[PDB]
Amino acid sequence: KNRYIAFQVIGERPFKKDEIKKAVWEASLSALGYLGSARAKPWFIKFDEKSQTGIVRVDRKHVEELRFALTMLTEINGSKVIFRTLGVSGTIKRLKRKFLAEYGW
Amino acid sequence: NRYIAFQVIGERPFKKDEIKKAVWEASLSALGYLGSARAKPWFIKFDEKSQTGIVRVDRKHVEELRFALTMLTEINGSKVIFRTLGVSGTIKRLKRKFLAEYGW
Amino acid sequence: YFVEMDVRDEEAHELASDWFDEVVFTKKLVLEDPPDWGSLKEELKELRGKYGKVALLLVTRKPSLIREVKSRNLKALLYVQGGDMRINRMAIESGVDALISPWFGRKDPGFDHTLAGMAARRGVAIGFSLSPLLNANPYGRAQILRFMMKTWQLVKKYRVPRFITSSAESRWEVRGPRDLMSLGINIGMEIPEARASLNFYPRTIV
Amino acid sequence: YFVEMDVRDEEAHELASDWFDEVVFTKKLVLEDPPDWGSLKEELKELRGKYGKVALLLVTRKPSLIREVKSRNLKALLYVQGGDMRINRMAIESGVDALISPWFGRKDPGFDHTLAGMAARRGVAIGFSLSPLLNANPYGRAQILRFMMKTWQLVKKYRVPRFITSSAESRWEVRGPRDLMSLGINIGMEIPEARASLNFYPRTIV
Structure with a gap:
């Protein structure tokens, strides 16, 4: 089973899809390394540039690891950032409804 | 804890300071700072004559660190190979069993 | 019901206040000798009216200053910055409300x-x-996390009260309740324990 | 009793030969069309006298070349480079000795x-x-390890034969038996299984 983490991104400026996709693989790579990263199996799904919200996928066992990895983030391309996890769900269906409807998808 | 004795094959002989540093780099890229914190790696000693050393880890995270060092490739612009000579629960047994041949 | 126990910046306080039910503003106080207790109580009273609940953080190397401030018996939570094994030690002995990060700047847990x-x-x-x-x-990240792990093992064993916190000196250092629970969890806390570090234990203190 | 199943460089072969009991030299053969089977058998015979046991690695995009080489029935172990999905597929169908790294250059396990x-x-x-x-x-490291994990789960389930190897094209890519077992183990193999990937299974093949 996988799990899906919905998150908000607070920053000095609005970020683009390409930047967050990249930034997800950097948090995990420094926090968990390539082995830990391979065990957690993180996977960027989508990012809504309007509302600065996104989704990322992980193995169910390694959720808190990846949540930690993103909180540990500080800076994306020379501009300070804060990741806030809005919630977790077993499906993008429930996730979008429960947590991302507000932004709104 | 558990202790891993290893040999270092390289272009160059390497000094204590370099390997100490290199142990924290293999682990940092392989396991990250969290995984590194769970494994608790700790450089003990390195014998520059025989290019052999010892490193400490939690017993649960041995194979992780063994993997981390095999994954290693380059130290300060000079290609490297780490070979683990063996593992033991004490530096006493380790030095006798695996490092007696080199020094020690 | 989550509680941010330590924020040290107006901007940080307001941001945390989006994501937290209770946010304790913290007055960082660098110390070598005693402070003017007139000026200090005045400054502390303003913060009570401004931010409600307030905490006083001592950062010093003189352990007597802990056992002096404490005595003045002020209307604010007494925090102390960890790091100096003297200060760590004294802080606990003096019955202070909390010791903040005993491992700070150290090469060992300091605990x-x-x-x-x-x-x-x-x-x-x-x-x-x-x-x-x-x-x-x-490197530092990994070191600190190791210290935090040992501390937690001890903290759990002796039923020591504890919380997780941002200790944010700017809004960029602020994180949400679940975001902070990750730290606890990955340090070894079970989920119910990590929730208590924001809920049950901070409630008890304030 | 450990076996290095694949090394592709004289310098690498001799180094592995310090740490391994049997080392199979491997002739990398890039292919678009059929090769001169005169020149090829000649070159293969030299290697038998030089390195004892020899393997032939096919790297190609034409699956018929697997079915053709295989048919020539040469005096050497038949390996095939993975990656293409056609080649992966054909390699298994043709009854070749081994398929090498089906995930090579892919964005999925290819298996x-x-x-x-x-x-x-x-x-x-x-x-x-x-x-x-x-x-x-x-990034790549993590991707590959994921692929290796899925492959192993399958490989274990269907009792598929397998080995671990350096596939060293230079001496710097060479690793010892236990050094290679780490890869197996961290991919999910239990220690006895990881030992068999160097001992029992490679013995059977040669």
Whole structure:
């Protein structure tokens, strides 16, 4: 089973899809390394540039690891950032409804 | 804890300071700072004559660190190979069993 | 019901206040000698009216200053910055409200079975601050996390009170309740324990 | 009793020969059309006298070339480079000795429950090569390890033969038996299984 983490991104400026996709693989790579990263199996799904919200996928066992990895983030391309996890769900269906409807998808 | 004795094959002989540093780099890229914190790696000693050393880890995270060092490739612009000579629960047994041949 | 126990910046306080039910503003106080207790109580009273609940953080190297401020018996939570094994030690002995990050700037946890025993007896909480991690480099990150792990093992064993916190000196250092629970969890806390570090234990203190 | 199943460089072969009991030299053969079977058998015979046991690695995009080489029935172990999905598929069908790294250059394992079934039936081994990991960057490392994990889960389930190997094209890519077992173990193999990937299974093949 996988799990899906919905998150908000607070920053000095609005970020683009390409930047967050990249930034997800950097948090995990420094926090968990390539082995830990391979065990957690993180996977960027989508990012809504309007509302600065996104989704990322992980193995169910390694959720808190990846949540930690993103909180540990500080800076994306020379501009300070804060990741806030809005919630977790077993499906993008429930996730979008429960947590991302507000932004709104 | 558990202790891993290893040999270092390289272009160059390497000094204590370099390997100490290199142990924290293999682990940092392989396991990250969290995984590194769970494994608790700790450089003990390195014998520059025989290019052999010892490193400490939690017993649960041995194979992780063994993997981390095999994954290693380059130290300060000079290609490297780490070979683990063996593992033991004490530096006493380790030095006798695996490092007696080199020094020690 | 989540509680941010330590924020040190107006901007940070308001941001946390989006994501937290209770946010304790903290007055960082660098110290070598005693302070003017007139000026200090005045400054502390303003913050009570401004931010409601207030905490006083002592950063010093003179342990007597802890056992002096404490005596003045002020209308604010008494925090102390960890790091100096003297200050760590004194802080617990003095019965202070919380010791913040005993590992700060150290090459070891700066905390042992004994300090845990005293902390439990005296009712002194331990602050698991995120701010150092944010500011450290990968090596440092790993070191700090190791210290936090040992501390937690002890903190759990002796039933020592504790919380998790941002210790944010700017809004960029602020994180949400679940975001902070990750730290606890990955340090070894079970989920119910990590929730208590924001809910049950901070409630008890304020 | 450990076996290095694949090394592709004189310098690498001799180094492995310090740490291994049997080292199979491997002739990398890039292919678009059929080769001169005169020149090829000649070149292969030299290697038998030079390195004892020899293997022939096919790297190509034409699956018929597998079915053709195989038919020539040469005096050497038949390996095939993975990656293409046609080549992966054909390699197993043709009953080759081993398929090397089906995930090579892919964005997915390039291996499924079906290919595993056929591999088991046909007695086709799977090569878990280290060389790509050494040459990849952290992102790539993580990707490859994921692929290796899925492959192993399948490989274990269908009793598919397999080995671990350096696939060293230079001495710097060479690793010892236990050094290679780490890869197996961290991919999910238990220690006895990881030992068999160097001992029992490679013995059977040579």
